[PDB]
């Protein structure tokens, strides 16, 4: 995020980090329950990647984080890689997340819910702060 | 480029798809929602994470960080997967697995 600010630690408890086998953060995701994470299809997650829950500072070794294996990647088969449309994948975890103060689920909307242009929302992540 | 160690946040507004098309043209599909162009931007490495809106006291996943300006320009809208268009598939997948 460019021109954002640091979050209160633990205050976005659904936010996960997707890390590759080398430990590199490459994408975010959101817990929707103890067994499932929603992410983008174009992130190209595989069962060799790891879901990291409960993290704030990726340079700290003192946070009680959960490194969760991925059992299966469910890419939405409406995903169109040419247009990047329907850009959603579900990750089924091999072992459940343990919910806590710092690890819990985001709500999902109904298909008929209205989120009007002009509404102020929030986005979070460990993406670049400067290109 | 700068990658942060610490989790970042930003508040930003939703756009209409019609207005977002003034920036991105026919790249904008019904299963996308734009947000930003407001002095902040999602950027590389944010992809897959949440765009949440607070409704009746609870944060709800409205978008998934998807794509946008190749320079993360804060005057251009970011593009997010529109969760309302995708949630039936989420529920079907959970139910079947």
């Amino acid at each position: 995020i460019v021109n954002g600010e640091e979050a209160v630690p633990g205050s976005w408890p659904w936010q996960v980090s997707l890390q590759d086998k080398t430990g590199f953060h490459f994408c975010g995701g959101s817990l929707i329950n103890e067994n499932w994470v929603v992410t983008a299809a174009h992130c190209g997650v595989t069962t060799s990647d790891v879901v990291v829950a409960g993290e704030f500072d990726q340079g700290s070794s003192s946070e009680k984080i959960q490194k969760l294996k991925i059992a299966k990647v469910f890419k939405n088969s409406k995903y169109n890689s040419l247009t990047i449309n329907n850009d959603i994948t579900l990750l089924k975890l091999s072992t459940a997340a343990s919910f806590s103060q710092t690890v819990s689920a985001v709500c999902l909307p109904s298909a008929s819910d209205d989120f009007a242009a002009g509404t102020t929302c929030v986005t979070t992540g460990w993406g670049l702060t400067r290109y | 480029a700068n990658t942060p160690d610490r989790l970042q946040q930003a508040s930003l507004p939703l756009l209409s798809n019609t207005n977002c098309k003034k920036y991105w043209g026919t790249k904008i599909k019904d299963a996308m929602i734009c947000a930003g162009a407001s002095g902040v931007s999602s950027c590389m490495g944010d992809s897959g994470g949440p765009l949440v809106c607070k409704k009746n006291g609870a944060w709800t996943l409205v978008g998934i960080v998807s794509w946008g300006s190749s320079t993360c320009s804060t005057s251009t809208p970011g593009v997010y997967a529109r969760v309302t268009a995708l949630v039936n598939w989420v529920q079907q997948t959970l139910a079947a697995n």
Partner: peptide, 4 residues
């Protein structure tokens, strides 16, 4: 444009 670029994936994010």
């Amino acid at each position: 444009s670029w994936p994010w």
